[model samples]
Target: DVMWEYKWENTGDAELYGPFTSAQMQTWVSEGYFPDGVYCRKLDPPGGQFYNSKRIDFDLYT
Candidate 1:
């Protein structure tokens, strides 16, 4: 659900591009892209499990 662009000058080699996910983002953080406490989230309910209802709603938020 993301897009990007890259530009480079010609020396002698080609390049590659790829898609990444949140897990990969975490890995990048370990590699030093982001510092600790820079990213955090608060959820309303701390640790609860729930199941999806057998209903369908056409709305995007649903």
Candidate 2:
């Protein structure tokens, strides 16, 4: 199962959001929760890399 975490962009620092599934994140997107510039990272797979808004596909995530 895939899961992710997100955070607001800060100056080299950000407080990580909790692990959430793709569908949950997509719901946030549909509700206009994340400001189009937040960062997302892989959680279940344990990826250390972080990706920005442009790199993520909110629709595809679901």
Candidate 3:
């Protein structure tokens, strides 16, 4: 499993999440956790701007 990592800061709350595989990300999205889209970039070390640029590339598991 690929450990897709990311971080974000919004409304004064900073969050660092994952090590999540592509599959997990897909589940979270379908579960309505990020209907606005997952705002994050690939964890390229210190990472980049919080944008939905590198979201998982698979569908939700049944």
Give me the runs in candidate 1 sitting further than 4 Å from their true place. 1-20, 40-62
What's the CA RMSD of model 2 in angstroms?
2.3
Better of 2 and 3 by lDDT: 2
For model 3, give the 10-residue run with minimal summed lDDT. Answer: 53-62
Q: Which has the greatest lDDT?
A: 2
lDDT (tens digit, per residue) of candidate 3 on 18-59:
557656666676777776665544443555555562354554
Alpha-carbon error at 7 in model 2, in Å? 1.0
Candidate 2, pairs of clashing residues:
none
Which number leads on TM-score?
2
lDDT of 1: 0.28
Per-residue C-alpha lDDT of model 2 across residues 9-34, encoded as one tens digit per residue: 74457688837887777677557787
Candidate 2 has its poorest 10 consecutive residues by lDDT at 9-18
Q: Taking the tens digit of each residue's C-alpha lDDT, what string does model 1 give over 1-62?
A: 22211112222342422134334434444565434312221123323232111121212221
Two-way TM-score contest, 1 vs 2, winner: 2
